[PDB]
């Protein structure tokens, strides 16, 4: 079973945490997209897919991926398994906390994909979000702005979950 993970950074923190995921997973079960440079039709590659996001600009998409989101209407996520993390920070903006992975997560599901990977919202203040689902983040959510000390537990934390919901 092979894992695509797609990311966009702009400051580097989320393609960090990437490499710390597929670490965490182990071997070459995960492999690396950066959608600076890959093409955004190999999210078709694979039935597992990890998404990550972080959010800027006050409630944006990373450029990365902002340019890329019309083209998600022309793909088909049915029958994969999709889970979302994001960096971001909570202190700055309370109001838009995590907002990419929502606004992404909102658009894959519609597409068809199914999350996996729902994350509590313990351990966190924040205002409002478009990542919450049933009182959930629809991924893990980190903050290396304001709670570096907690990325690499949540991290663990995490992988062992996804190895879990997507039956590895
Ligand atoms: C100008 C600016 C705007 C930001 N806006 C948001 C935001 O709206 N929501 C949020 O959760 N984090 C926000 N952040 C926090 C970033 O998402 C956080 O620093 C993140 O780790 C950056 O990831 P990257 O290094 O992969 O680009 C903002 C950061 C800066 C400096």
Same mark, same amino acid.
């Given at each position: 079973?092979?894992?695509?993970?797609? %990311?966009?950074?702009?400051?580097?923190?989320?393609?960090?945490?990437?490499? +710390? #995921?597929?670490?965490?997973?182990?071997?070459?079960?995960?492999?690396?997209?950066?959608?600076?440079?890959?093409?955004?039709?190999?999210?078709?590659? %694979? =039935?597992?897919? #990890?998404?990550?996001?972080?959010?800027?600009? !006050?409630?944006?998409?990373?450029?990365?991926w902002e340019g890329l989101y019309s083209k998600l209407d022309?793909?088909?996520?049915?029958?994969?398994?999709? !889970?979302?993390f994001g960096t971001g920070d909570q202190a700055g903006y309370?109001?838009?906390?995590?907002?990419? +992975?929502? +606004?992404? =997560? =909102?658009? #894959?599901?519609?597409?068809?994909?199914?999350?996996?990977?729902?994350?509590?919202?313990?351990?966190?203040?924040?205002?409002?979000?478009?990542?919450?689902r049933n009182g959930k983040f629809v991924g893990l959510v $980190?903050? =290396?702005?304001?709670?570096?000390?907690?990325?690499?537990?949540?991290?663990?934390?995490?992988?062992?979950?996804?190895?879990?919901?997507?039956? $590895?």
């Amino acid at each position: 079973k092979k894992i695509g993970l797609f %990311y966009g950074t702009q400051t580097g923190k989320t393609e960090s945490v990437a490499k +710390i #995921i597929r670490d965490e997973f182990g071997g070459d079960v995960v492999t690396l997209h950066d959608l600076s440079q890959a093409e955004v039709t190999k999210l078709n590659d %694979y =039935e597992y897919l #990890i998404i990550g996001c972080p959010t800027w600009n !006050a409630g944006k998409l990373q450029s990365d991926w902002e340019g890329l989101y019309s083209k998600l209407d022309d793909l088909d996520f049915s029958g994969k398994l999709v !889970a979302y993390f994001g960096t971001g920070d909570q202190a700055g903006y309370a109001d838009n906390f995590q907002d990419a +992975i929502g +606004i992404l =997560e =909102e658009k #894959i599901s519609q597409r068809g994909g199914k999350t996996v990977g729902y994350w509590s919202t313990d351990g966190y203040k924040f205002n409002d979000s478009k990542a919450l689902r049933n009182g959930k983040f629809v991924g893990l959510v $980190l903050d =290396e702005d304001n709670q570096s000390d907690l990325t690499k537990e949540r991290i663990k934390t995490w992988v062992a979950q996804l190895k879990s919901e997507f039956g $590895l």
